[PDB]
Amino acid sequence: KLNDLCFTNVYADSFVIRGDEVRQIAPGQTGKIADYNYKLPDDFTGCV
Amino acid sequence: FGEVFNATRFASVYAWNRKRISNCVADYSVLYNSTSFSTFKCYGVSPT
Ligand SMILES: *[C@@H]1O[C@H](CO)[C@@H](O)[C@H](O)[C@H]1NC(C)=O
Ligand SMILES: *[C@@H]1O[C@H](CO)[C@@H](O)[C@H](O)[C@H]1NC(C)=O
Numbered sequence: 001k002l003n004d005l006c007f008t009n010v011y012a013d014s015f016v017i018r019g020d021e022v023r024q025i026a027p028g029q030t031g032k033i034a035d036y037n038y039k040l041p042d043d044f045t046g047c048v
Numbered sequence: 049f050g051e052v053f054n055a056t057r058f059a060s061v062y063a064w065n066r067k068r069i070s071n072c073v074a075d076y077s078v079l080y081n082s083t084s085f086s087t088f089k090c091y092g093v094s095p096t
Contacts, residue, residue, distance in 0.1 A: 018084065020084040020085060020086050021084070023088070028094060028095065028096055029095060029096075030095040030096060031080070031088075032077075032080040035077075
């Protein structure tokens with residue numbers, strides 16, 4: 001549906017991590033990235 | 049966590065190993081610097 005929509009309050013976040021840690025960029029995750037570095041909301045709209 | 053995740057020799061999958069754990073605090077934040085995991089998935093409980 002991305003091609004048929006209009007988007008409000010768009011932001012882009014950028015960083016670099018280790019390959020093993022990519023699974024932690026998701027709602028409700030644990031680990032050091034998801035605890036001390038970068039946290040997503042439980043109710044998240046957007047793409048990773 | 050040190051003789052489970054940091055053992056010198058692991059078993060073969062056909063004769064897999066089983067170990068009892070009791071009477072200990074489960075503070076896993078000690079593995080944040082120790083051990084990078086490509087897979088970590090929990091069933092019946094939320095990681096948070
Ligand atoms: C993490 O582990 C590395 C490699 O052993 C070590 O150099 C570093 O000091 C450790 N960091 C701390 C303080 O936990
Ligand atoms: C695992 O054991 C090795 C053996 O010397 C040690 O160098 C390493 O620091 C240990 N890693 C831990 C305890 O996280």
